Design an enzyme around this catalytic site. Structure first.
Site, mmCIF file in Angstrom:
data_model
loop_
_atom_site.group_PDB
_atom_site.id
_atom_site.type_symbol
_atom_site.label_atom_id
_atom_site.label_comp_id
_atom_site.label_asym_id
_atom_site.label_seq_id
_atom_site.Cartn_x
_atom_site.Cartn_y
_atom_site.Cartn_z
ATOM 1 N N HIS A 102 53.494 -24.568 54.032
ATOM 2 C CA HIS A 102 52.476 -23.874 53.048
ATOM 3 C C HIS A 102 53.043 -24.290 51.468
ATOM 4 O O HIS A 102 52.159 -24.400 50.704
ATOM 5 C CB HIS A 102 52.462 -22.181 53.139
ATOM 6 C CG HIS A 102 51.724 -21.650 52.416
ATOM 7 N ND1 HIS A 102 52.083 -20.790 51.423
ATOM 8 C CD2 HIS A 102 50.437 -21.652 52.579
ATOM 9 C CE1 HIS A 102 50.990 -20.243 50.741
ATOM 10 N NE2 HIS A 102 49.894 -20.563 51.378
ATOM 11 N N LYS B 119 43.398 -4.213 42.117
ATOM 12 C CA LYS B 119 42.448 -5.149 42.227
ATOM 13 C C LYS B 119 41.318 -4.863 41.566
ATOM 14 O O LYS B 119 40.604 -5.887 40.901
ATOM 15 C CB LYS B 119 42.183 -4.965 43.811
ATOM 16 C CG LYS B 119 41.250 -6.095 44.357
ATOM 17 C CD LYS B 119 41.748 -7.392 44.490
ATOM 18 C CE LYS B 119 40.721 -8.332 45.277
ATOM 19 N NZ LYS B 119 41.412 -9.658 45.732
ATOM 20 N N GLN C 77 49.367 -16.373 40.326
ATOM 21 C CA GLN C 77 51.077 -16.376 40.620
ATOM 22 C C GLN C 77 51.694 -17.354 39.674
ATOM 23 O O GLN C 77 50.920 -18.344 39.776
ATOM 24 C CB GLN C 77 51.495 -16.342 42.034
ATOM 25 C CG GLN C 77 50.811 -15.123 42.924
ATOM 26 C CD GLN C 77 51.484 -15.011 44.043
ATOM 27 O OE1 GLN C 77 52.617 -14.718 44.213
ATOM 28 N NE2 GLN C 77 50.729 -15.268 45.063
ATOM 29 N N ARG D 263 37.927 -6.651 36.823
ATOM 30 C CA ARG D 263 37.023 -6.185 35.442
ATOM 31 C C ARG D 263 37.731 -6.934 34.357
ATOM 32 O O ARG D 263 37.055 -6.908 33.663
ATOM 33 C CB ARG D 263 37.169 -4.574 35.797
ATOM 34 C CG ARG D 263 36.423 -3.946 34.719
ATOM 35 C CD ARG D 263 36.373 -2.288 34.721
ATOM 36 N NE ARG D 263 37.531 -1.995 35.421
ATOM 37 C CZ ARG D 263 38.787 -1.691 34.793
ATOM 38 N NH1 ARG D 263 38.820 -1.889 33.470
ATOM 39 N NH2 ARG D 263 39.473 -0.963 35.366
#
Ligand SMILES: O=c1ccn([C@@H]2O[C@H](COP(=O)(O)OP(=O)(O)O)[C@@H](O)[C@H]2O)c(=O)[nH]1
Ligand SMILES: *[C@@H]1S[C@H](CO)[C@@H](O)[C@H](O)[C@H]1NC(C)=O
Lengths: 695, 14
Positions: free
Chosen positions: A185, A565, A506, A570
């Site tokens: 990963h 979230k 991130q 938004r």
């Protein structure tokens, strides 16, 4: 004593031959002859731990450490066992004792660092990894683990040399036939060749095979037709992330959208029910939902999948947390495909296909993948935003002065009715605008005082920073908000009179080349700021130092906390332009910013993970936002920040096309997914091995 | 997020 020595010796031999059970029987015989054999207990424990018999391994580790109080290696390995049993405090205690018994024990320091790393304490993880490397300079696991910690917090000290060493370590481990210290990963983050990246993944695939071969299960008999399923294709979705996780945030509507006349949907959960609405929905809408977290044995779990008669089994994890790729290694289904959750190749022969698209995985680079390519017609990416955040489909603004579309924004299911109760509302060509009257002053007052909510004309008006206090389910995206929400640049300290460039990824996705590019853009557009997240906060001072070194004052970069979230999606409406990370793009994050109507500038690379954003933008229909090189990326971003009419055109384009394009159309996506499944099945049914499905 | 949790794509243990 002497006889016990030879028994333990024989066990080690049979162990190396791969005869694990004979090794166990022999270790037990050695203990029967000489009970106080520390080495025998430690050896048996290690073998039991490998078989996944952790409780039994724990018994023998405890014996070893009683017999030998200076047995630091045993404390260390016992810690490893506790870690795997998810007893983190216990593991740390063991690692701590190991280091106390022998301060020069390099492995124990690295093992302690990994606990700190998994616990989120990166600075302490870095400190412990450096100690391990100080004690043992040649320590690939510790160096690579340290490199990823440094990536997480944007510490780029000796970066180029670090990258060279990582590649050097991987090359050596691949040569000497050992599992690479770089996780598949993470391999997307380092300048490894596509050959090396595939080889790393292949090693992990073979681990899974090694673990299921000891079960000595025969190959499963697969269905050759759809007669027993009444003409329906049985599709099994296997995921550890049915619940609160980006994976469900993207695909939770898909199982319920499958055509029941042609498809029978089985969802195989690798995690227990987390109590969220995401899990509720998939359990309610799938034809069958099976909790495999209650079935620890991969053999029994694979038997369960095969019993269901699955035709196509879908791997939604790859090498991510909670994965049980052993299930796929056992091949309970005739066709097995990678989909959505893992942005890379499995490298594994037991995976037949990877569901991707022509933009993400051009047929020219099929050699990067072990799987055959299976193309969705637009992008393989999808998101549940139209269902989860329908209140963001439309917006209105408050004119607090020209007219801005992203300074003070209202969204709500009942926004229209609220607007209809107001006089002097203007429509800009379509965006409703509330003038600077009594209504608008009351709204700004709420924000400044940090008030949670107010009422205007009977309508509930909520402070966008306070969603968790009003409705926590709405904040996390489990429910649609039932109030009208206000979002403002002042909520985040963003300039009212300047261009806002954002990136909500991130921080690990940023590299020196990327920040330099961003610095080049900021310098060319003096009236602008870069908006980033404390993700994690300890990355903030590093980014700021590097920016300051590049000649940017502290005020050109603004940090916000990570948000719930709904607020995260938004607040994307406040930015002018998103600057995507080329090393590894925004994936879920890319979908989030586009749903807010924010243009995203991207530069696709060679790895899957570096090409996702371009795929999303191609589906959306904004080819002009895709850069072929760093100079073009800078020129595009600067053009958007300076040619204000161009900016309006592109923002209007994103705003409209997130609805009119296929990008967020989950019904269309599912139907195209179904078409692809049938292509796979017909190909197999006709007696063919997997081949690229690229038309 | 502070006071809550923000799940992300993460590697499996090795
Ligand atoms: O302030 C934020 C920033 C991000 N997110 C969410 O955090 C996750 C980020 O996960 P990851 O970094 O793995 O996203 P990806 O690589 O897919 O872009 C996504 O679900 C985002 O929607 C959030 O809830 N609040
Ligand atoms: C995070 S989860 C998301 C949904 O399945 C997935 O598409 C994405 O690629 C993941 N991100 C990374 C960097 O692995």
């Amino acid at each position: 004593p002497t006889h016990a020595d030879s028994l333990n010796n024989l066990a080690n031999i049979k162990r190396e031959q791969g005869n694990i059970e004979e090794a166990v029987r022999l270790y037990r015989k050695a203990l029967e002859v000489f009970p106080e054999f520390a080495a025998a207990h430690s050896n048996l424990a290690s073998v039991l731990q490998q078989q996944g018999k952790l409780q039994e391994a724990l018994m023998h580790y405890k014996e070893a450490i009683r017999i030998s109080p200076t047995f630091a290696d045993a404390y260390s390995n016992m810690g490893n066992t506790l870690k795997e049993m998810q007893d983190v405090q216990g593991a740390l205690q063991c690692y701590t004792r190991a280091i106390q018994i022998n301060p020069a024990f390099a492995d124990a320091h690295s093992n302690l660092a990994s606990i700190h790393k998994d616990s989120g304490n990166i600075p302490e993880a870095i400190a412990s990894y450096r100690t391990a490397l100080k004690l043992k300079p040649d320590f690939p696991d510790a160096y690579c683990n340290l490199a990823h910690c440094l990536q997480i917090v944007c510490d780029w000290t000796d970066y180029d040399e670090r990258m060279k060493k990582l590649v050097s370590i991987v090359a050596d481990q691949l040569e000497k036939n050992r599992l690479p210290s770089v996780h598949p990963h993470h391999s997307m983050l380092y300048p490894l060749s596509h050959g090396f990246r595939k080889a790393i993944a292949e090693r992990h695939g073979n681990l899974c095979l090694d673990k299921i071969n000891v079960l000595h299960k025969p190959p499963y008999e697969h269905p050759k037709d759809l007669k027993l399923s009444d003409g329906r294709l049985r599709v099994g979705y296997v995921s550890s992330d049915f619940g609160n996780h980006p994976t469900s945030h993207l695909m939770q509507s898909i199982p319920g959208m499958h055509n029941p006349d042609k498809f029978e949907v089985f969802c195989y959960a690798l995690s227990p029910d987390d109590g969220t609405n995401f899990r509720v929905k998939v359990m309610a809408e799938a034809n069958h939902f099976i909790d495999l977290s209650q079935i620890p044995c991969n053999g029994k779990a694979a038997d369960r999948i095969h019993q269901d008669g699955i035709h196509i089994l879908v791997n939604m994890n790859g090498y991510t947390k909670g994965a049980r790729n052993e299930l796929f290694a056992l091949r309970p289904a005739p066709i097995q495909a990678m989909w959505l959750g893992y942005p890379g190749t499995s490298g594994a022969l037991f995976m037949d296909y990877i569901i991707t698209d022509q933009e993400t995985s051009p047929a020219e680079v099929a050699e990067q993948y072990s799987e055959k390519l299976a193309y969705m017609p637009h992008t393989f990416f999808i998101g549940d935003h139209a269902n989860m955040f329908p209140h963001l489909k439309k917006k209105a603004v408050i004119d607090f002065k020209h007219i801005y579309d992203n300074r003070i924004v209202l969204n709500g299911i009942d926004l229209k009715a609220f607007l209809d109760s107001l006089p002097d509302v203007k429509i800009v060509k379509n965006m409703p605008v509330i003038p600077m009257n009594t209504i608008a002053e009351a709204v700004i007052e709420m924000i400044n005082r940090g008030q949670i909510q107010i009422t205007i004309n009977g309508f509930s008006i909520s402070n966008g920073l306070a969603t968790t206090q009003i409705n926590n389910k709405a904040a996390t995206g489990e429910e649609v908000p039932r109030t009208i929400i206000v979002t403002t640049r002042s909520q985040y300290g963003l300039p009212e009179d300047a261009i806002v460039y954002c990136n909500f990824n991130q921080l690990y996705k940023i590299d020196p080349s990327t920040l330099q590019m961003w610095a080049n853009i900021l310098k060319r557009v003096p009236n602008s700021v870069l908006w980033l997240l404390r993700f994690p906060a300890v990355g903030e001072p590093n980014i700021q130092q590097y920016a300051q070194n590049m000649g940017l004052p502290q005020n050109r970069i603004i940090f916000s906390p990570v948000a719930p979230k709904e607020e995260h999606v938004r607040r994307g409406q406040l930015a002018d332009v998103c600057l995507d990370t080329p090393l590894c793009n925004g994936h879920t994050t890319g979908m989030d910013v586009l749903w807010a109507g924010t243009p995203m500038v991207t530069m696709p690379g060679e790895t899957l993970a570096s090409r996702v954003a371009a795929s999303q933008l191609t589906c959306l229909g904004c080819l002009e936002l895709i850069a072929k090189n760093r100079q073009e990326y800078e020129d595009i971003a600067v053009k958007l920040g300076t040619d204000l009419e161009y900016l309006k055109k592109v923002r209007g384009k994103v705003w409209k096309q997130r609805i009119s394009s296929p990008l967020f159309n989950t019904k269309q996506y599912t139907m195209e997914l179904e078409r692809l499944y049938l292509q796979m099945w017909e190909h197999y049914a006709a007696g063919n091995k997997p081949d690229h499905m690229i038309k | 997020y502070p006071g809550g949790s923000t799940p992300v794509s993460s590697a499996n243990m090795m």
